[PDB]
Amino acid sequence: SRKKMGLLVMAYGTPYKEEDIERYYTHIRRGRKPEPEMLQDLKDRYEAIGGISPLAQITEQQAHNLEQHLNEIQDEITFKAYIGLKHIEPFIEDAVAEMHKDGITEAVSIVLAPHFSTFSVQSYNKRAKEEAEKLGGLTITSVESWYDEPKFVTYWVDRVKETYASMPEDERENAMLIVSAHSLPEKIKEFGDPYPDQLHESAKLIAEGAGVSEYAVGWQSEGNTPDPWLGPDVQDLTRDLFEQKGYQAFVYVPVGFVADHLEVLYDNDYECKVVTDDIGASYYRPEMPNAKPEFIDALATVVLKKLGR
């Protein structure tokens, strides 16, 4: 009795082993192979965060748990998950071609980044749709953003609540919550890109839900290009806020990210921690969603709402 549908889960992508660093970053750098020192530095960062093998596995687990959960919570549709990536195989186009080959004629897609941007989400969605158009006989309805799904907001609200409950009374009263996402070039403003506004809205929703009156919005992990990227960067924001008001604890919620990848494990857990240790403040960074049941149910709800179910 069920209708079969493809579930196209898209993501930035991550290397599978250390030997993939070169090609993964060359792709990210638009064809410019990292110099030897940079290649070695990257290997060192990945070693520091515990290894590469767990990275892509989280993403795989997210798509797999999402598929099974969607299949268990409703009885009209049977979903088959397909992972499509931007910077390493399986690429977005490979996944759509596989759905077509397997006989899928109808699919719903969702990107594993909650905020919409012209730079990433819009482009991922456009690519998936152009491949389906090229092949024919297959259509895709794509989720554009989901940062405002209540269940997702609640996930972070409750992790933030636990973190503040865990602090000594003196920290609890002199803490600063920093909500961030991946920085992008400021030129996206030329298109009226809502990306910045959505991150600020996530920060408002989370702080408000957790009853946090002192918070700030920051960006992290910017690429190196001659044109300016969205700021302030979390490292600078932390120091400036400390110099101006003397906060004793900083809590980082990298809401734009959904997994324990390099951006969180190194750019927050190491780079932000260097700063907090330098100023004598405590560092807190609540658990990323990863493939936990609570997150998977939030994503399932986002997908069913998009299909009017």
Is 202 a known ligand-binding residue? no
Please give, one letter per residue, the 3-state secondary structure of 104-161: CCEEEEEECCCCCCCCCHHHHHHHHHHHHHHHCCCEEEECCCCCCCHHHHHHHHHHHH
251: enclosing H helix or E strand: strand 249-253
Is 31 a known ligand-binding residue? yes
295: enclosing H helix or E strand: helix 293-306
Is 277 a known ligand-binding residue? no
Is 266 a known ligand-binding residue? no
100: enclosing H helix or E strand: helix 92-101
Residue 86 is encoded by which pair of tokens?
């931007």
Is 45 a known ligand-binding residue? yes
β-partners of residue 151 are none
Is 22 a known ligand-binding residue? no
Is 271 a known ligand-binding residue? yes
**Residue 86 near residue 121 (C-beta atoms within 8 A):** no
The amino acid occupying position 196 is P
Is 267 a known ligand-binding residue? yes
**Residue 6 near residue 62 (C-beta atoms within 8 A):** no
Is 124 a known ligand-binding residue? yes
Residues in the annotated binding site: 12, 19, 29-32, 45-46, 53, 124, 182, 187, 263, 267, 271
Q: Binding site for Fe(2+): residue ranges?
A: 182, 263
Q: Which residues are annotated as a binding site for Mg(2+)?
A: 19, 45, 267, 271
Residues belonging to the binding site for Fe-coproporphyrin III are 12, 29, 45-46, 53, 124
Binding-site residue positions for N-methylmesoporphyrin:
12, 30-32, 182, 187
